[PDB]
Amino acid sequence: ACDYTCGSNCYSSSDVSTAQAAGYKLHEDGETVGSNSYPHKYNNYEGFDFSVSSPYYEWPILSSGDVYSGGSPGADRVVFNENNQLAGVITHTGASGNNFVECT
């Protein structure tokens, strides 16, 4: 029941989880993926309704349902916390630069 479509996606909170598990696992290990430092804090602000408690961790979401491993994952990105939850589904969808925005 895709609930988070990043323009060209279809991974509801059920799909995000998978992506999160990645961000978390690596997070719980304190490791990163790629040349960047993901996951990492994402202290929302743009106006995200994260039905989760902080801190919020931003992580990329692979439309393939895999675990990112680079610096440039894509517009599609999942946000969570240190609990194993999901903040939502952000995307570089013309967010107006490097800004993020909850997918559709």
The CATH number covering residue 19 comes to 3.10.450.30
Say how many C-beta atoms besides its own lie within 10 A of residue 31's C-beta. 11
Task: Name the token pair of 82.
Answer: 């240190």
Which residues does the annotation mark as catalytic? 40, 58, 92
Number of domains in the chain: 1
Residues 6 or more apart in contact with residue 33 via CB below 8 angstroms: 22, 26, 39, 60, 67, 68, 69, 70
Range of the domain at 62: 1-104
For residue 2, how many C-alpha atoms fall within 13 Å in the half-sphere facing its CB? 12
Q: Please enumerate, as own/partner, the contacts of 35-38 that have beta carbons within 8 Å and a separation of 24 or more.
A: 35/70, 35/71, 36/70, 36/71, 38/68, 38/71, 38/73
